Sequence to fold (1280 residues):
Amino acid sequence: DRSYAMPFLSRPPALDGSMAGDVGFDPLGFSNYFDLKWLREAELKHGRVCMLGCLGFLVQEQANLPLPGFDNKLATEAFFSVPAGGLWQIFFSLGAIEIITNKGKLTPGSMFTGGRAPGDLDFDPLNLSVDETALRRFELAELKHARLAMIGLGGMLHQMLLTKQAPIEQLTNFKSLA
Amino acid sequence: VFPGQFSDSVPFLKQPTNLDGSYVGDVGFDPLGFSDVFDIRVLREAELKHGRIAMLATLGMVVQEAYTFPFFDKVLPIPAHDVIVKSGGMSQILLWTSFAEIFGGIALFQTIQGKRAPGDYSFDPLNLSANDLEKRERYALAEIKHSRLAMLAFSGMVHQYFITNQGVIEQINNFRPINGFPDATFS
Amino acid sequence: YKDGIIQGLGVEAIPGAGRPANLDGTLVGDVGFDPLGFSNWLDLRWAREAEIKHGRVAMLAATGMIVQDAYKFPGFEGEFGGAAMMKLHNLAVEQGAMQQLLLWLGLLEIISGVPAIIQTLNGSERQPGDFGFDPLNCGANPDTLARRQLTELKNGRLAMIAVGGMVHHYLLVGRGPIEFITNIPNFKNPLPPF
Amino acid sequence: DFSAAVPFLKRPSNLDGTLAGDVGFDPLGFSDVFDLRVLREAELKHGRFAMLAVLGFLVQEVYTFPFFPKMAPVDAHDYFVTQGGGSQIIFWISFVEIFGVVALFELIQGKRDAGDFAFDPLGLGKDEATLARYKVAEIKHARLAMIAIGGFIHQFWVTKQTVLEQLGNFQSL
Amino acid sequence: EPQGLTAPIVHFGSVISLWLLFALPVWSAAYKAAGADTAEWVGVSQVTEDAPGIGLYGKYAPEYDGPTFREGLEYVLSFAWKPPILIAWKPRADLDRAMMDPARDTVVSSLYKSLGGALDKTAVYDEEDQLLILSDMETFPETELGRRRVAQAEAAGWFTGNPSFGKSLIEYSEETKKGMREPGTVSISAKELAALRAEAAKK
Amino acid sequence: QAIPGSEPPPALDGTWVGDVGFDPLGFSRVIDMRWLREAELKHGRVCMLAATGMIVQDIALFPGVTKTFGPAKITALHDVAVKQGSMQQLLVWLGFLEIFGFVAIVQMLQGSGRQPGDFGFDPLNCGANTDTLARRQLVELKNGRLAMIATGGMIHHFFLTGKGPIEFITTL
Amino acid sequence: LAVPFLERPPMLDGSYAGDIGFDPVGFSNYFDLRWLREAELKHGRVCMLGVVGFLVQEFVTLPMFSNGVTPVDDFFVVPATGLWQIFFTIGFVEAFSNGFKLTPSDMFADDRAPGDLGFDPLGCGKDPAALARRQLVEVKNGRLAMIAFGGMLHQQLLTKQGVIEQLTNFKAI
Ligand code: CLA
Ligand code: KC2
Ligand SMILES: CC1=C(C#C/C(C)=C/C=C/C(C)=C/C=C/C=C(C)/C=C/C=C(C)/C=C/C2=C(C)CCCC2(C)C)C(C)(C)C[C@H](O)C1
Ligand SMILES: CC1=CCCC(C)(C)[C@H]1/C=C/C(C)=C/C=C/C(C)=C/C=C/C=C(C)/C=C/C=C(C)/C=C/C1=C(C)CCCC1(C)C
Fold:
């Protein structure tokens, strides 16, 4: 009984393989001490936020809204160049989205009491994932993209903080560190 | 080439699920399956509205360059948009077309209930194909074909103006390649 | 050879006296000679191991005293000069030969003798002074092995006494062993720097 | 039952001989007190680090990357302390051994063999006889390199010259 | 020039707003009519089922029934204040000075035994109070000389007047609650004593 | 049977064009066969057209094209034509065609009935009968692989020497 | 049917005058048809008198007041006092004619005809067939007059000219 991701480690007890994206990679044993529904919900929320964030990092440097203070190419500096009132409006709109899509159940002890799959916010306007096998494939793809986007957003943000250069532009104008 | 049932237009794509062929202009061309997501009636109403608007648009894009009214002023249609926006007549066009579309929306909602044919406003004052039924489907096919052709043609005329900066009549008589390509180097 | 006439109950040194109770003529070299009662409070295994180790180290030391005074390895005679005996130690400490010897012999003792010491004190089958070092299969015959054991013990005693003698000869006169035996008169002695 | 390696010492009670390289050598008897599996894990990690270090000393002496400056392997340590490459290296070693801690915990629980990370990407060892032979060879090379890396470092410290350089002109002092 | 609601900009903004407001119901109804619920609108992927990472069910949502969130945070803190790191270099279990042949002892093993190692025989307890103050007091028998000395002194006035002289607080509290009145004294109520004193001083 | 020492994956069991059991890494274990064959035919056809076009370009050019593009070929030609707008036109129109290619792949994977690489483009009814069609399938696949390798070769030859195909093979 | 592409409204049976099934926005449903008919008749009558007022005020001015540039501006040149007299007179007329019921709930308590305030002093509405014809004529003329009034008021506001004056002096804006 060994995990697939860590062949030298035993498979975590809570990671039987039924949940999507499961290769037995829980070395620190978070699933033994936290609700796996909560962990999957947090993983999916982080990954979706990071997918949209990487898309924004790639888009803002090429296209910008024709508004005053909205022409900054470096997104880290664009956070401080855009007026803060709009940012707080975005914050409150996303908070309203969080309230609505969770039915007012925000705490770990109440989010899944009413009965809801982790990451299932009732968003499939194309009515995809009716097929179960296609749903499993799409869940694996979504999880892989979520993890890849988390890593990519971290990398792009840190490179922009350090080199003060936006992505792709940094690739074309690769300046090695001093 | 391989045996199997496919669409009449695209031979490597199957016939769409909701394109049975009752509606005119249906050659089984729906690759992305818009008819699978949304109702075919609403899509046909949208198509006919777009097509009629684009028919009138192409006729206008021709005539305005061909002949401008004694009022207003001699100007190309694309900047004439901004000229009439500043003049205020385009707001009135918007108001009257919105008044028509107020009833158009109720017509569309009754189309979803299946009480009227999509795009059928029963507007035949000249009874060109009202008394005869055989001519009606022929004219419907002609209308949908001209609708598609008009949408393509209007998009083409507009995007030809955007890069050529010439009128449609001007371009078919003084045809010049874009960007000075006749004598361009290292383009 | 282990005969009972050179060692054991038969022969008995300082005759007219009684053998110690612990010294029952079982170990090698038991001639019943133990004044001062050292065999009553001291473990015979520890004492025999100490005697064997002292004898072996003294044999090596005496052979070194003889050879160094006659032949020196190339390179050392230029670094140290004509110094020998008790001067070679102080020069080798600064040079590094003595430090290297101390480190290597200490590591060897730590990984060989101390575990052997504790195993043979706690009741192992390893006899004191026995490390099983028998290359070339010397003394495979048990009678020959007993002869070798007694000879090694006696020669170790002789070596210890001779090494003490040579050290004191150098501390008094200031010459090495063969130099001391070829310069018998006590006159014309050089400086013996300690 | 005396030790095979040390004829005058008893074989340690925890060294039955099943492990690779278990010749019975344990004079101080660390295996009598501390867990043998953990000791073999430490031995293998030390030996693997040392083998990589010896190969690195040889290669760095014979070839340095053109975008890196040229210097001896030992005094490059401070150069990469200041530059930050060494921080990256220890960062990634620490990242791997965060999961190494979990591997050690599973080894303590008895659910993993000592030094067995199941890292055989090329599939070199699959036959049991070849696997045992490779285990013996690995442990022997680990010990040899553990000695050799300290040898390289101390020879550089005393002679102020690298390995093949010293083999070029053998200066004795 | 026109501003506010009379401006054409607000006019086309209003028509776009009405377009969205009517886009919600018309396309919601067109969706409800079609829905893509036919048994051919399925997702496709190049990945086969045998690829790792694919779960057994679509949306599993396991029942947790495990340690609380506070206990999980304490576990994450124990990652910091007690990692399983120095527990590796702990003496072996199943070590005792009964199976360990002394004839196999080594430097570390002997040093470990001398430092109180393999002490599995320490199940014995001291079984001594070590705070027990002895209280076995002995009563000296009373002699006839001494029984004649408690007399001739009780008659002389001793034993009366100070009942708590040579007695400690606890000792005097033990008496006057289970008996042992002051010798030479009797018990009388306050009112009766006052009446007797009044009759004694009568006339 | 390609490699005697190893064995083909269970997905490679005949009933496919060009199946000689050559798949040591095991792509067919994790990737659907229809997608793989569609990709193989698309790569093969693209590289066939690319190689033939590179040969023709290095042999004879169009009238008036040298006045604008100059003496630039392969990669320099691409770098100039992206600014010219020719490659923008190619990208737009070929992506427009690949939209229908995409829905074709989707319908194939969900079971419409079409085979990989079958777009129904058979003018003049060439090779549409009997075993000639299967022979043409094998020929197309093998020539596509050959053209793929040849296209890589020509691209890397221009990377190394900076010369076109017909002049690199004659000026060694 | 007024709108051929839409169904006939459920609440428009054809009892009222001028009903041609024109209610795409469906105010006939979700409201009281009698209330809507009375509102339509009142709007029609008010605008019907207002159009005649706009016509008359151009050429005829009462001697007490001073005529403005346009009949729209005739509202401002008259004093604010006297204007509220008209407001209160209209309030009294609308209270007495409606029987002091002024809400959608209490009105039509006796189920009178919508728009029938009992004002027929000349007795023209006696023949029921002529009554229905005049109902149709009144409703159609009110529908025309409301549009006409809403047009002529804005023409007077924009051009600052009287309606006949504008028709005799037509000009662009
Ligand atoms: C004040 C609160 C507190 C308490 C109650 C504990 C309690 C404990 N800690 Mg701990 N810790 C604390 C604060 C605290 N810690 C803080 C503030 C830190 C710094 C962040 C740590 C860092 C820490 C580490 C890194 C480790 C512990 C470990 C332990 C456990 C050791 C018991 C054991 O397994 O025996 C065995 C314990 C031994 C020490 C035996 C090993 C003997 C070897 C041979 C010693 C060799 C010397 C070696 C180099 C360490 C000595 C260093 C010295 C030279 C300076 C014990 C539960 C250890 C453990 O296993 O946790 C489960 C462990 O690895 N703690
Ligand atoms: C709805 C129709 C209506 C009714 C039923 C009505 C009833 C009565 C009665 C009761 C029988 C009296 C006694 C009375 C008398 C006065 N009326 Mg009325 N009056 C009506 C209409 C107007 C208008 C339009 C105006 C007006 C005014 C005056 C002035 C002048 C005051 C002054 O010169 O300051 C006086 C004295 C003018 C005004 O008040 O402002 C100047 C003016 O503009 N009245 N009015
Ligand atoms: C500190 C520092 C650094 C550093 C560093 C480092 C990494 C220093 C590393 C030093 C090391 C690894 C020394 C190892 C010595 C091993 C010995 C003596 C083994 C002897 C084995 C023997 C004798 C076996 C004997 C035997 C036995 C028992 C068994 C068989 C018999 C026999 C063969 C005889 C840097 C370079 C990073 C720079 C930094 O700025 C400062
Ligand atoms: C449905 C229909 C049937 C067939 C024809 C057609 C197809 C065109 C279709 C469309 C019909 C249409 C578009 C009808 C349009 C009707 C409209 C826009 C009516 C608008 C009327 C506006 C009116 C009263 C304004 C009245 C304002 C009044 C009093 C008071 C003004 C002022 C005065 C002087 C006193 C102080 C207060 C104030 C405001 C300054």
In short: The pocket of IHT (ligand 3) is lined by residues C 111; D 74, 77, 147, 149-150, 153 (CB under 6 Å). Helices of chain B lie at 34-37, 40-66, 77-87, 89-112, 134-164, 168-171.
